[PDB]
Amino acid sequence: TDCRWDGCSQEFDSQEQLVHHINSEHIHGERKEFVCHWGGCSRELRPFKAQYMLVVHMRRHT
Amino acid sequence: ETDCRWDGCSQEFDSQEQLVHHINSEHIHGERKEFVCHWGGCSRELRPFKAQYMLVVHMRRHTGEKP
Ligand SMILES: [Zn+2]
Ligand SMILES: [Zn+2]
Ligand SMILES: [Zn+2]
Ligand SMILES: [Zn+2]
Numbered sequence: 001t002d003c004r005w006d007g008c009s010q011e012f013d014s015q016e017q018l019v020h021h022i023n024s025e026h027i028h029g030e031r032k033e034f035v036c037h038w039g040g041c042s043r044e045l046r047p048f049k050a051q052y053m054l055v056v057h058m059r060r061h062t
Numbered sequence: 063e064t065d066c067r068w069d070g071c072s073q074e075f076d077s078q079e080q081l082v083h084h085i086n087s088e089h090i091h092g093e094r095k096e097f098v099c100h101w102g103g104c105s106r107e108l109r110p111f112k113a114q115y116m117l118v119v120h121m122r123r124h125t126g127e128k129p
Contacts, residue, residue, distance in 0.1 A: 004102035004124070019127050026100070027118060035098055037089070037110065039067035045108040047100065055090055061067070062082050 006047070007032070036061075069096065069110060099124075 001018050003010040005026045012018045033047035034054040038061045048054045064081055066073045068089045075081045096110035097117040101124045111117045122129060 006100040006102055015126055019125050022121050022125065023118075027114070027121070033098065033100060035096065035108070035110075037069035037096055039069065045098070047098075051090065055086075058085050058090070062063070062078060062085065 001012045001014055003012075003018060003021055003026075005022070008025070010021055010025075012021060031051075032049055034049070034051050035045050035047050036043055036054060036057055037045070038058075041061070043057075048057065063078055064075045066075075066081060066084055066089075068085065071089070073084055073088075075084060094114075095112060097112070097114050098108050098110050099106050099117060099120055100108070101121075104124070106120075111120065119129070121127075
């Protein structure tokens with residue numbers, strides 16, 4: 001019944017609430033994770049909170 | 063400098079400009095082709111799915127939701 005989506009502190013009473021939460025916030029909600037999938041990147045797939053930060057980060061690989 | 067290492071991409075280019083344009087066009091602003099499960103302790107280890115529907119079915123392993 002508790003959310004373990006990295007960055008999420010949400011705890012619930014029931015499976016049905018967790019299911020609705022994950023669908024609402026983490027699947028269909030505003031995208032808040034922007035991962036660099038560059039092979040050997042020292043971030044190790046740790047997400048940025050905004051696309052702009054990923055764009056700036058890509059200058060390090062190019 | 064010239065070659066893309068974006069997970070599941072092996073485009074190689076002649077110039078830095080070509081690589082910069084490729085990354086922006088395909089990996090930043092292109093159709094999304096990576097769907098990561100950020101569930102703590104997930105055995106996938108943040109390895110991406112190709113499609114949103116695949117992440118949706120995968121979530122039922124963390125929730126226990128019957129299909
Ligand atoms: Zn959550
Ligand atoms: Zn990176
Ligand atoms: Zn690429
Ligand atoms: Zn998972």
